[PDB]
Amino acid sequence: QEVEETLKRIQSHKGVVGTIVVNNEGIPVKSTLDNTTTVQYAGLMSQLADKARSVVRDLDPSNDMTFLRVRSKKHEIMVAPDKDFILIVIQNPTD
Amino acid sequence: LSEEQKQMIILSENFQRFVVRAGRVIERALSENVDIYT
């Protein structure tokens, strides 16, 4: 399997551009992008996910963020952060 | 970090089941952003 057959099922969703998995540390695990780039996203997104999760935590300590997504003009990035790993996917909206 | 290690994780039950969680969570977002019926 379900892992390889799911990680790929995403990569081929209509409009998906890239997909990356990281860990708490911000270290890329598997990733469908050129590695020098895949570095960028991991670093930044991990930071973003921290701040956000932290923001969510300060608005309320009994709450934890489950899902975050920032939309640009060019595309949307989403990020599902889950304790030790976080899944980034860039998609190309339509909208 | 290292090579063989990425492997060990990829084949864990920590990750195998995390990828399926995030997976499902996302797969909704993914189809909101896009008309799959067109």
Side-chain angles (χ1 to χ4, degrees), chain A residues 2-94, chain B:
Chain A
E2 288 202 47
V3 148
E4 306 94 29
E5 141 200 32
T6 270
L7 217 116
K8 181 192 139 159
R9 129 160 65 154
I10 275 173
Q11 172 62 43
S12 48
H13 189 45
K14 276 168 191 178
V16 181
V17 165
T19 299
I20 304 172
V21 190
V22 143
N23 58 339
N24 18 58
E25 265 51 18
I27 295 294
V29 168
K30 214 354 205 193
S31 138
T32 87
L33 303 173
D34 77 76
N35 196 68
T36 59
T37 292
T38 294
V39 191
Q40 279 274 24
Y41 280 80
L44 302 192
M45 294 323 288
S46 238
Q47 288 156 34
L48 196 55
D50 291 18
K51 181 80 199 165
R53 253 179 62 73
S54 297
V55 154
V56 176
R57 284 299 208 120
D58 311 334
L59 296 170
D60 177 332
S62 72
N63 203 21
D64 310 8
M65 160 183 113
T66 108
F67 184 29
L68 137 54
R69 50 223 263 239
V70 349
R71 199 195 215 80
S72 350
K73 281 121 78 91
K74 321 226 210 153
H75 60 44
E76 177 148 16
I77 284 152
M78 33 232 150
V79 186
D82 289 38
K83 202 246 242 240
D84 42 15
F85 295 131
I86 78 208
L87 206 200
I88 290 96
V89 175
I90 335 291
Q91 209 200 358
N92 261 140
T94 69
Chain B
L1 269 144
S2 106
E3 199 34 55
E4 272 42 46
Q5 289 178 305
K6 290 184 174 152
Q7 202 35 246
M8 292 204 274
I9 319 193
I10 292 172
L11 308 182
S12 72
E13 301 124 44
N14 205 356
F15 171 114
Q16 186 130 335
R17 284 202 286 144
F18 147 82
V19 126
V20 167
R21 250 61 182 243
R24 166 142 11 267
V25 156
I26 271 190
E27 272 251 321
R28 272 113 98 201
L30 283 188
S31 84
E32 276 169 8
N33 297 335
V34 152
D35 192 36
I36 58 156
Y37 285 94
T38 272

